[PDB]
Ligand binder design. Structure first.
Ligand code: CLA
Ligand code: CLA
Ligand code: CLA
Ligand code: CLA
Ligand code: CLA
Ligand code: CLA
Ligand code: LMG
Ligand code: SQD
Ligand code: SQD
Ligand code: LMU
Ligand code: LMU
Ligand code: OEX
Ligand code: CL
Ligand code: FE2
Lengths: 28, 333, 96, 54, 52, 41, 34, 55, 37
């Protein structure tokens, strides 16, 4: 039942990375 | 304008959010398939017989592993260095029983990282830069290739490659120290010096540059807000930093030229990593480190021990216990 | 290939990797042998071609002991070869 | 199979057919742009990079 | 220049072949009766084998 | 098998700081929008 | 399993040909000093 | 046409010389000499494909 | 692409905050016993 927790944490980290890359503050 | 010309114009365009280029045509599909297979295998793969003795080992989360202990097991010892694609198996279940995904992941991944290096050079060329960043990136690529491909080639089996897990690397390192006596190879010493010196130089450079900031904010504003994108200010008010470094140590040792300083910064860790990767590649063919066991004797002829003998005892303890059921004969050739 | 005489005409480099080494040979004819005394069966080969495991399955509102088919997880390493024995006759019957 | 020594792993006609189809399709697309090149001695240049149009 | 030095390389390869076939022979480790020096009298020329 | 309190520890210690940081960012953006006169106050 | 081999071969040759014929299309002239 | 004729004449002189001497040396015609070197010798080609399907 | 003229602001005064907090806490108090069973 902890496999759910592990999967949730990993997918959340990947979502954070996606949002950081594609929704980012403009450097200008 | 032909269709091919328009396609070529789009591929090599600098207006895209992420550059594609022609090395991208190889980088993207391979990396994507490797990522998909790795995620699926790490989550839900069945146990794999790695030693060829019909003793499967579990490595997936669904089979009772946590993040630290989970891994993707290398292929079976019975396969050896033979190519094992999916279509060469009688069924997908047999492919998963013999550690099929490892070969797929490692091969598509190595192709991907080589294409990544090429793409770095290509964008540098298109932007009008100098073409030597990918030379710096070549060292981690060399190390990863060294382990994953070169060690199995020398030892004669894919089952000796580094597992794709956290504790798999620990197992790999312990067995490698037991069998090859690393930590006495000078190339490993070079690599350790490289990483330690890289960290030291990074900390020194950061401290020196940050200390020499000019006052433009006062108190209620983070000091990072004083810099503007496009501001012209050389990366160190000299008198301060130069005098500080000339007074801290022997004065004649002070880099007053930025080009030489940054060149040395680039040179040190890259050379260290190159040397350690070559050390691993050479030890893949059984050219081990220094051996000083029983080298000091008294007048009569009895043996006086040193620290190398204690290291040897630890190596013997590691050696007699690894792969317990796999050996049948006295020598581990 | 199929008979021993054809198999002996190939070289080892010509058989490696094909999968012919795990096969069993074929015989052609319908005659009689009648073993003398001091005979020995030599070069016996046994090759399975189907596997099944006893279990309990449900057919229609009932459960029975039925043999279910299974897939070989290993590879072509399951053929027995080279078996030898000594033949004899007890009361007109052969014993291996 | 696995350890046999076929050229490029080709063991069937379909594999050879698809390889030919791929190389030829991309080749025809490239030809649609570079199929009018001539070898006459005035399309050459004297330099390090061919800037002479097409 | 490339063609000239390439022709030289080809001549060198043919010289090795001539040494193997006529000028004493080479050491063959698969010799019938123990490894020894012998003349290679019938080299294979079928292009399928070489290019395979 | 595993300890039950780890569920509570992991989930709470992950969820609370995330919401704290999101609140910080959102209040900063709201103050910035308020300072510059516009349709959204 | 043969159909999987056919599809994979098609994909690989497609991408490799894209690479090969892309680098032949007067690549050295695609620089900002044209 | 005259240029083509003379070129083909010289080339055919060379070709006829080569064909005649190859036939004399090998004791065979050109077809039986080139045909074997197209697929494989028998002693080198693999036995075949014997892996059972469906297991 | 451009500046959307349909964006607006969201407000919440202290009284509504107190009402929401009280509602959430009281609802949890009521349903906890049945959730635990
Ligand atoms: C850039 C594209 C690309 C490349 C180069 C590869 C490369 C590879 N894939 Mg992969 N793959 C890709 C995209 C790609 N993949 C995509 C998008 C998918 C999803 C459909 C897959 C799905 C996939 C599977 C399911 C499998 C592979 C496998 C393989 C390996 C053997 C493939 C083979 O026999 O090709 C044969 C190709 C040729 C004979 C043509 C090559 C001709 C030129 C001249 C190359 C010559 C190069 C030479 C060394 C110099 C190889 C490492 C197999 C594997 O890893 O098994 C362990 C395998 O089972 N791939
Ligand atoms: C304090 C002690 C100490 C120190 C400092 C080191 C230091 C080192 N050891 Mg070591 N070692 C030690 C003790 C120590 N060792 C002991 C006691 C043992 C015996 C048990 C060993 C046994 C040992 C072995 C067996 C090996 C080392 C290796 C190394 C080197 C690591 C190479 C590396 O990380 O860069 C290399 C960098 C990489 C591999 C990274 C590649 C990155 C790829 C290209 C891209 C990855 C991208 C990623 C997948 C996706 C990113 C995510 C995305 C979202 C951004 C390093 C010099 C290794 C070595 O020499 O390497 C060749 C090695 O094989 N050591
Ligand atoms: C008093 C503290 C001290 C000192 C003076 C040294 C000094 C040294 N260590 Mg060392 N080391 C220390 C503590 C120390 N270490 C500790 C606490 C550990 C972890 C237990 C290590 C682990 C370690 C490893 C694993 C290695 C060294 C190595 C070295 C040598 C080269 C390192 C270098 O130049 O880095 C760059 C720093 C400035 C340029 C150098 C003689 C390396 C070596 O060459 O050994 C001969 C090497 O392989 N050390
Ligand atoms: C007449 C034209 C001619 C000839 C005969 C050569 C010949 C040679 N050049 Mg060369 N060269 C030429 C023009 C020529 N070059 C031009 C125009 C330039 C530009 C300036 C150069 C620049 C050049 C450089 C920079 C170098 C050479 C080198 C060499 C030697 C390489 C030998 C070697 O390592 O093989 C090893 C193996 C051999 C196999 C056996 C050789 C056979 C048995 C000899 C056959 C000789 C044969 C009668 C000649 C055939 C005629 C020819 C037209 C085919 C070789 C003697 C290299 C060298 O070491 O020079 C000392 C070298 O570094 N050349
Ligand atoms: C394709 C070239 C080739 C290859 C594969 C070999 C292979 C061999 N030779 Mg040989 N040889 C060659 C050319 C070649 N030779 C030539 C041209 C000469 C004349 C100088 C000789 C002279 C020679 C002698 C005198 C002897 C050998 C011997 C040997 C054997 C062991 C030596 C060894 O380690 O080989 C190392 C060879 C290589 C690493 C070559 C690999 C080349 C690969 C295929 C790439 C080539 C393509 C290249 C990149 C060009 C690109 C073209 C461009 C359009 C892209 C081995 C079977 C020895 C032996 O066993 O004899 C009994 C021996 O005594 N050779
Ligand atoms: C591309 C053309 C070509 C090809 C593939 C061959 C191929 C061959 N020739 Mg050949 N030959 C050719 C043109 C060619 N020849 C020409 C133009 C001449 C005239 C000079 C000769 C003269 C010639 C002779 C005299 C001999 C060969 C021999 C051979 C065989 C060795 C081989 C089958 C030899 C042969 O067949 O011996 C068995 C042989 O003795 N050829
Ligand atoms: C030099 C570079 C020139 C090419 C530029 C293109 C670079 C593109 C990157 C290529 C990577 C994609 C290649 C994947 C091919 C693949 O895995 O093949 C995988 C196949 C193996 O194929 C396997 O073969 C087995 C044999 O029993 C079975 O048949 C398997 O079914 C079959 O999959 O390997 C080859 O095709 C290798 C052939 C290439 C080696 C000879 C090269 C000829 C020229 C030599 C000079 C270079 C050295
Ligand atoms: C894996 C399990 C866990 C899941 C975690 C999340 C995994 C998600 C992986 C996939 C998400 C990333 C791929 C999709 C994003 C994308 O394609 O952007 C790629 C952008 C958008 O493309 C194009 O689109 C843009 C708009 S348009 O083309 O001009 O209309 C344009 O700006 C851009 O220049 C142009 O290149 O550019 C490219 O490089 C092409
Ligand atoms: C016994 C032989 C056996 C083999 C030994 C090989 C030794 C090769 C020595 C020459 C190699 C190139 C020297 C540097 C060139 C350059 O990049 O300049 C960059 C500057 C030169 O100084 C800068 O030089 C400038 C002048 S000039 O342009 O370089 O002429 C000057 O303007 C500036 O102020 C100054 O900072 O050098 C550095 O700051 C980088 C430091 C690392 C470079 C190597 C320095 C010497 C190392 C000795 C060998 C160490 C062995 C380590 C073993 C792992
Ligand atoms: C979505 C992707 C994640 C998959 C879901 C993860 C959570 C469920 O995953 C599951 O793993 C095991 C699978 O055998 C279960 O293990 C057990 O599950 C049942 C619990 O009612 C038992 O009756 C079964 O004998 C057994 O399958 C764990 O109880 C559960 O954790
Ligand atoms: C040729 C591929 C079709 C697949 C059928 C069987 C696959 C086994 C061999 C495939 C790969 C081996 O490479 C192959 O090269 C030769 C041609 O280049 C083949 O030879 C083939 O082509 C010759 C030339 O027309 C024909 O006369 C032969 O009948 C044919 O067998 C060999 O059979 C094989 O060695
Ligand atoms: O797999 Mn990995 O470690 Ca190279 O030695 Mn033998 O094998 Mn196993 O034992 Mn020791
Ligand atoms: Cl053993
Ligand atoms: Fe800077």
């Amino acid at each position: 039942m902890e496999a759910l927790v592990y999967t949730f944490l990993l997918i959340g980290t990947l979502m954070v990375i996606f949002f950081a890359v594609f929704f980012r503050d403009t450097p200008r | 304008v032909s269709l091919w010309e328009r396609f070529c114009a789009w591929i090599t365009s600098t207006e895209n959010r992420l550059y594609i280029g022609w090395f991208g045509c190889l980088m993207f599909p391979t990396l994507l398939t490797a990522t998909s297979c790795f995620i699926i295998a790490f989550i839900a793969a069945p146990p794999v017989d790695i030693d060829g003795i019909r003793e499967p080992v579990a490595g997936s989360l669904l089979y009772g592993n946590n993040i630290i202990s989970g891994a993707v097991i290398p292929s079976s010892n019975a396969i050896g260095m033979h190519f094992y694609p999916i279509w060469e198996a009688a069924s997908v279940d047999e492919w998963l029983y013999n550690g099929g995904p490892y070969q797929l992941i490692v091969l598509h991944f190595l192709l991907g990282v080589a294409s990544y290096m090429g793409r770095e050079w290509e964008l540098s060329y298109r932007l009008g830069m100098r073409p030597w960043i990918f030379v710096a990136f070549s060292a981690p690529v060399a190390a990863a290739s060294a382990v994953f491909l070169v060690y199995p080639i020398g030892q004669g089996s894919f089952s000796d490659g580094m597992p794709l897990g956290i504790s798999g690397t620990f197992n790999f390192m312990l067995v490698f120290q037991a069998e090859h006596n690393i930590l006495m190879h000078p190339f490993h010493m070079a690599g350790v010096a490289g990483v330690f010196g890289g960290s030291l130089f990074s900390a020194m450079h950061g401290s020196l540059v940050t200390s020499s900031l000019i006052r433009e904010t006062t108190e209620n504003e983070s000091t990072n807000y004083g810099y503007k994108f496009g501001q012209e200010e050389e990366t160190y008010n000299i008198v301060a930093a130069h005098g500080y470094f000339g007074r801290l140590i022997f004065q004649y040792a002070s880099f007053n030229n930025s080009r030489a300083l940054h060149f040395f910064l680039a040179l040190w860790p890259v050379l260290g990593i190159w040397l350690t990767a070559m050390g691993i590649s050479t030890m893949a063919f059984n050219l081990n480190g220094f051996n000083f066991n029983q080298s000091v004797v008294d007048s009569q002829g009895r043996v006086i021990n040193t620290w190398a003998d204690i290291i040897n005892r630890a190596d013997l303890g590691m050696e007699v216990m690894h792969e317990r059921n796999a050996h049948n004969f006295p020598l581990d050739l | 290939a199929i008979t021993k005489s054809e198999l002996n005409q190939l070289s080892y480099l010509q058989v490696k990797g094909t999968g012919l080494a795990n096969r069993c040979s074929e015989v052609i004819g319908e005659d009689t042998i009648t073993p003398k005394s001091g005979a020995r069966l030599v070069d016996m080969c046994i090759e399975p071609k189907a596997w099944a495991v006893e279990e309990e399955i449900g057919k229609a509102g009932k459960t029975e002991k039925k043999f279910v088919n299974s897939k070989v997880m290993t590879r072509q390493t399951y053929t027995l070869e080279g078996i030898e024995g000594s033949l004899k006759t007890d009361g007109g019957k052969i014993v291996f | 199979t696995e350890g046999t020594n076929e050229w490029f792993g080709v063991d069937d006609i379909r594999v050879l057919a698809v390889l030919f189809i791929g190389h030829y399709f991309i080749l025809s697309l490239w030809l649609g742009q570079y199929g009018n090149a001539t070898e006459d001695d005035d399309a050459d240049f004297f330099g390090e990079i061919d800037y002479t149009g097409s | 220049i490339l063609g000239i030095h390439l022709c030289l390389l080809g001549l060198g390869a043919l010289l090795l072949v001539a040494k193997a076939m006529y000028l004493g022979g080479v050491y063959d480790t698969w010799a019938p009766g123990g490894g020894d020096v012998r003349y290679i009298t019938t080299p294979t020329l079928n292009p399928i084998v070489i290019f395979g | 098998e595993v300890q039950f309190g780890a569920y509570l520890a992991v989930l709470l210690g992950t969820f609370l700081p995330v919401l704290f940081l999101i609140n910080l960012y959102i209040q900063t953006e709201s103050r910035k929008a308020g300072r510059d006169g516009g349709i959204d106050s | 399993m043969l159909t999987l081999k056919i599809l994979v071969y098609t994909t690989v040759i497609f991408f490799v040909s894209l690479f090969i014929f892309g680098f032949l299309s007067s690549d050295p002239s695609r620089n900002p000093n044209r | 046409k005259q240029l083509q004729e003379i070129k083909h004449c010289r080339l055919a002189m060379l070709g006829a010389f080569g064909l005649f001497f190859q036939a004399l040396n090998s004791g065979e015609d050109i077809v039986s000499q080139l045909s074997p070197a197209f697929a494989a010798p028998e002693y080198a080609a693999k036995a075949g494909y014997f892996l059972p399907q469906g297991i | 692409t451009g500046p959307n003229p349909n964006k607006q602001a969201v407000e919440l005064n202290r009284t509504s905050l107190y009402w929401g907090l009280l509602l959430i806490f009281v609802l949890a108090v009521l349903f906890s016993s049945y959730f635990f069973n």
